Amino acid sequence: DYYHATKTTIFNALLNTIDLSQLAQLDLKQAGEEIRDIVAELVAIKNVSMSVAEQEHLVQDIINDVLGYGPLEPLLARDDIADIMVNGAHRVFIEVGGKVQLTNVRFRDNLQLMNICQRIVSQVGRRVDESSPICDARLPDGSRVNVIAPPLALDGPTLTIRKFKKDKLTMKNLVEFASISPEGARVLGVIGACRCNLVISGGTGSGKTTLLNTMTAFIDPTERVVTCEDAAELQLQQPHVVRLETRPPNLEGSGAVTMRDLVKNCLRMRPERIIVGEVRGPEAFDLLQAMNTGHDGSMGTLHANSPREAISRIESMITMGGYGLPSKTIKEMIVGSVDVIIQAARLRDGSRRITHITEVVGLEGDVIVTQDLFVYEITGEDEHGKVVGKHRSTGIARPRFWDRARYYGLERELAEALDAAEA
Amino acid sequence: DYYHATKTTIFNALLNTIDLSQLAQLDLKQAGEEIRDIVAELVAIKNVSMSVAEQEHLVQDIINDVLGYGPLEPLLARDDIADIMVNGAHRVFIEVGGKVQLTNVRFRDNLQLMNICQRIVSQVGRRVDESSPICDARLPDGSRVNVIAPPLALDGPTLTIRKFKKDKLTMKNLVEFASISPEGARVLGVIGACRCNLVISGGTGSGKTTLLNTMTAFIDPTERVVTCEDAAELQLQQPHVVRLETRPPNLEGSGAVTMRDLVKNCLRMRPERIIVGEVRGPEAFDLLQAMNTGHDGSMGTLHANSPREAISRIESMITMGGYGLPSKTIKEMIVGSVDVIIQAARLRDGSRRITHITEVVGLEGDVIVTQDLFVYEITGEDEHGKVVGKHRSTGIARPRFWDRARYYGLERELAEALDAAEA
Amino acid sequence: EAFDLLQAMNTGHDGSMGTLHANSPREAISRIESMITMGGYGLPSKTIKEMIVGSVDVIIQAARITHITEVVGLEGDVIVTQDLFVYEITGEDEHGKVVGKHRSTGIARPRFWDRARYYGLERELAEALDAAEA
Ligand SMILES: Nc1ncnc2c1ncn2[C@@H]1O[C@H](COP(=O)(O)OP(=O)(O)NP(=O)(O)O)[C@@H](O)[C@H]1O
Ligand SMILES: Nc1ncnc2c1ncn2[C@@H]1O[C@H](COP(=O)(O)OP(=O)(O)O)[C@@H](O)[C@H]1O
Ligand SMILES: [Mg+2]
């Protein structure tokens, strides 16, 4: 009570001596000294029990409450926190290490929630109020912010904050987690710099984005890479990258910049390879054009269960655009475009596996045929109950892209990895 | 070294005295004289250790700041810099000798780069802002400019200035670069004077404009040709040719003269054959009508990848007009108005090709019939990786345009081309 | 708008529940297809049905809770749909009540066996659904 009552009583002196309406006059620079003196004046005039160190702590608390973000100032500094969800004034949760835990932190009222939300979302020109209910933005620090207003939220306005993860699983980690055999890792390392146009496929939450990020690390630093994402998840260690992001309609169908527009624009920036975040709409067609007109090295991630279904989904996405194409021409384009297809699924035990590393043999008649280089076969469950299985080659000595490895000087490594497959 | 602080002080002094807010006064020559005098006075007063040459260079920097393109001023005016890329505001790259490389040049802040881009795109009366972040322009001097704004780009505004080298290629050069061989290309020379409709189709950077320039130099001087372009690109050497160019909306969003406004007028200038630079939207319709009603021998470069896709694109472009004709009627208009639909596309390696010399025959309802006088197939890759393919005369001694081209007596060379290379 | 919900039910947000007004499971799926097509997205009906299969696992068809049914897959326009609980009518009572019974169809492994095993509830399924047959 005292640790809160002292502040509740002291804040009145600071508010009355210089009202918040005086903002921009004696700003942060002068405001720091103003608060440092006003807190001391209030402590001297009004008896206080907190110590001198406690006096400085309360001065800093006043600074945070007046200028800073107040309640959320400590949380935003902790690196072990990923999400900060509010949903109210006294009921605030956080996420540390996957799980979600409630916290003992309290606002003052709903009006303070609105104040903090507006003062934090204004940093990127957004404005949310009773007339504008919803707000969604990407702050400069590298975080996502979302806010919902009263008229819709019966319980009251809600706030949601995220973070940009900086510890992503490297290829060595995936090797440790036994999701891809070391021979598979060697073959993937060959493919990465081999400039093959891979297309990652897998079910929801099967490890697609992480696998794509791991693959991107094999790019030589002397190439322009332009990434078209919707959530800004990837991070590359190359010295030359042009990160792009779409924009949803901020009003009733105005200002939309669909991923198709970004992919189409990238064709003119002279990229060396286009990397897409998630191919959902008709943009697939444009991406295939990029995969065809001398940008060997592109990558993508769709949502399919098996590579055959990945091909079917690509055809469906192309047809969705309504270009009036004949199906056989689409199949020819896909056959000439996609060189590799990596399948990433998750099993009933919660683990993640790379079921297939497939290549496209071509088109025979009216059917698309494929060859395989690694297949994850299940055999049973161990005593505990975890899934049990292992990979294997299909006796294919020189892949359909061996000449590429010869061209780029990776013939020896690929030959050793594939010959070592017989182990 | 220390020139940065001294230059900042000099710029501040000049702005305080000769402020940029006095625009419309102290014009170019007056601005230069005033800046020189002010910089000399400041060097006399402001403590600067720079020498006389250093003072002159500081004056030049002041001039660039006041009325220049910013630190890019020396970048654009060098000898053999093919491409100039700006990824953000600190990592400007340049391409030399067919390979990229970093440059120590760097800007002052993202805002200055944004202003510089918004000014460079001003030469063509176009605007880039937060409500329209993508800009693609052809500078009058001939270079190509692309700009993306912070709302989409994450690392700051992204800029790409790709200059174009000297004078285009003749048909002889196109035969030298294996683009097409005479035995299957003689139809190009035949149509160079056969005066039949033609529509070049291709993808970005596929060389459509150069193909048109090569295929229009055959037209004999006696004919009156009216060329319509978004910006000066073609350099025909015939004696009787009329050139035009559109005007985008002015400062107040008025005075726009779109391609339709020019083609509809050219319909009443007694032209013998129109040459449209690039077809984008409704103008297509008018051009087709021009080809249908007397003005036989037109040309127009659209944007597509496959001839069927090109025809569907034309259909959609006309549908944008809002007349209410069926697909079959518009396809018949194409058949009787479009004779040859060439295709130009880059292969998986990049080198230019001519994948089609196609002709339109007729209709069988809502489905078009399209003979393919020529096609282009790909065998695989070469020892060094570059693609290997073959054009082949599909074989038609008497094509659809046999009758349409019988007047000039050109069925002779038509039979020669389509029989001397039938196998 | 169901589309968004159906997108939620597939794109990682497991455990979404919707409420519509349709008589039979075929009628429910037909209504879902019509609603999806109503949005102007123009998705071919085949892909809409595939999305419906992906997003729908359990149908509590009240019509009483007359039906509890689940999807099995697709083979074309046909939407393979089996049953878990069926309510049948046998006659009428002197007071006029509709006399019937509610049968656990009999199949032991519904489509959601894997989820139940993951969360540690297959034993409950055996204790309830397998014992219901006997
Ligand atoms: N092989 C793996 N072993 C362990 N954890 C993994 C593995 N692959 C991915 N993860 C975890 O999965 C998360 C990475 O995001 P991911 O699961 O790939 O999202 P996503 O596939 O982009 N989802 P969506 O695009 O919405 O379907 C992290 O928590 C990783 O630790
Ligand atoms: N056969 C060819 N060989 C090499 N370069 C070519 C060939 N044909 C065209 N080009 C190149 O294409 C460019 C022409 O640009 P183009 O793609 O026609 O502009 P647009 O983007 O408007 O289509 C020229 O710079 C030229 O060097
Ligand atoms: Mg052009």
XYZ file of C-alpha atoms and ligand atoms in Angstrom, chain B residues 138 208-209 233 277-278 301, ligand 3:
8
model
C 11.849 6.523 -68.137
C 10.308 -5.936 -77.603
C 11.137 -2.318 -78.445
C 12.419 5.511 -77.657
C 4.911 2.452 -78.612
C 3.322 0.348 -75.878
C 3.962 -3.957 -78.237
Mg 9.514 -0.574 -74.444
